[PDB]
Amino acid sequence: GEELIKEEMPMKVVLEGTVNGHQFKCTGEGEGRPYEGVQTMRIKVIEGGPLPFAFDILATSFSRTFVKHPKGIPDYFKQSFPEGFTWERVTRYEDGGVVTVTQDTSLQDGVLIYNAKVRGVNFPSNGPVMQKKTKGWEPNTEMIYPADGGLRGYTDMALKVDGGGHLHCSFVTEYRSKKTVGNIKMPGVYAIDHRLERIEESDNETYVVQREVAVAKYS
Known part of the structure; x- marks a missing residue:
């Protein structure tokens, strides 16, 4: 399972959707170090750009294989390969916004x-x-x-608001392996610290480069 996940892995993404009826399509390419929990992705808005909404609400939909797990916490994500896993998410913004996302992760x-x-x-x-x-x-x-x-x-x-303040949002994600869980060692409860940073932007956010560092830990 993990033996298919090398110290460096490239990734490719297609994302499609609608926000308040506005349709768009994005593609991404990047790479990271799955065991160090660091990854970068170059994202193009290919259809519907410039978007009439903040790219930030899509930022967390573009990568669970790249989490640093200490020795004692089994890695559900890396054990899922080669078939991979799916995730489904519901996000609720304090000011009324609701986002649903479904995602397929495979290794090809x-x-x-x-x-x-x-x-x-x-x-x-x-x-x-x-x-x-x-x-x-x-x-x-x-x-x-x-x-x-x-x-x-x-x-x-x-979410940091330009001019100051935060917009608070909650979400719930369900992560499910496409590999039978019979061949997967399961963790108990634990925490992941995430930092998601935009390192490059162009043309009213039609080109976005973002870096995530994610580290699993005991609670």
Whole structure:
């Protein structure tokens, strides 16, 4: 399982969706160090750009294989290969926005392949998201709970608002292996510290490069 995940792995992503009825399509390519928990992705908006909403609400939909796990915490994600895993997420913003995402992760000729679909509704026209007035995500901790042969993650996350302040959002993720869980050693409860940073931007966020560092730990 893990032996297919090398110290360096490339990844490719296609993401499609609608937010408040606006349709768009993105592609991404990048690479990271799965055991060190660091990854970078270069993302192009290919259809529907420039987006009429903050790219930040898509940022967390573009990579669970690249989490540093200490010796004592089994890695559900890396053990899933070669078949990979799916994740499904619901995010709720404090000002009314709701996002649903479904994601497929597979491994094809040693490349991690991501396919994502995003549906966003009820973002307020005067809020920082539809006004494109956001400045990225604050570092956060996700709580991971084993649940029916898979994992459930919970995060309270804060989106920085340009001019100051935070927009608070919660979400719940269900991570499920495509490999039988009979051949997977399961962790108990644990936490992941995430830092998601935008390192390059161009042409009203039609080109975005973002770096994530994610480290699993005991709670």
